[PDB]
Amino acid sequence: MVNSFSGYLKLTDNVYIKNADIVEEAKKVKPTVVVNAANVYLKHGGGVAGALNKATNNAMQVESDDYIATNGPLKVGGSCVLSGHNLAKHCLHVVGPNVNKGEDIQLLKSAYENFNQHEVLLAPLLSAGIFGADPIHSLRVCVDTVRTNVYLAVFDKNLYDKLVSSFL
């Protein structure tokens, strides 16, 4: 049984990790679900969200603005399913707490629980990067929360090496 993903290191029964640009991984694999590191307003300005949105030629932002106009903002820890555009069938926009905004780090587990609604996902580490949480802590919450198959793309090589070498 051939896997659509390649080059991932298995961390647990269901969690895999790779030093890769999630945009490049999405273009290569076109997964059923790509996770975006969203904010409550779905304003995809920077980090993973800015990069995914730019890869969609801003179509993700246009769709997101219509979603917000209809539904209002998401909650920190919440998510919504929108189109994956050219990158995936769906994009699961998940809001991890942003430590730089003083958001509750306990909501990181709630954010990862959204992944359990999908059999397999291509995802970044929630609340990592510009969201300010410790990525080692995010990976621990991921492995202790997500039960579905998650393929984590870590953009930074030095961080990827540190995450693998410190994994328990």
Swiss-Prot record:
Membrane disposition: Multi-pass membrane protein
Description of activity control: Inhibited in vitro by GRL-0617.
Recorded catalytic activity of this chain's protein: Thiol-dependent hydrolysis of ester, thioester, amide, peptide and isopeptide bonds formed by the C-terminal Gly of ubiquitin (a 76-residue protein attached to proteins as an intracellular targeting signal)
Top-level lineage group: Viruses
Protein name: Papain-like protease nsp3
Record organism: Severe acute respiratory syndrome coronavirus 2
Subcellular location: Host endoplasmic reticulum membrane
Subunit description: May form homohexamers. Interacts with N protein.
Gene: rep
Protein task: Responsible for the cleavages located at the N-terminus of the replicase polyprotein. Participates together with nsp4 in the assembly of virally-induced cytoplasmic double-membrane vesicles necessary for viral replication. Antagonizes innate immune induction of type I interferon by blocking the phosphorylation, dimerization and subsequent nuclear translocation of host IRF3. Also prevents host NF-kappa-B signaling. In addition, PL-PRO possesses a deubiquitinating/deISGylating activity and processes both 'Lys-48'- and 'Lys-63'-linked polyubiquitin chains from cellular substrates.
Domain Macro intervals: 2-168
Result when mutating residue 165 to L: In strain: Gamma/P.1
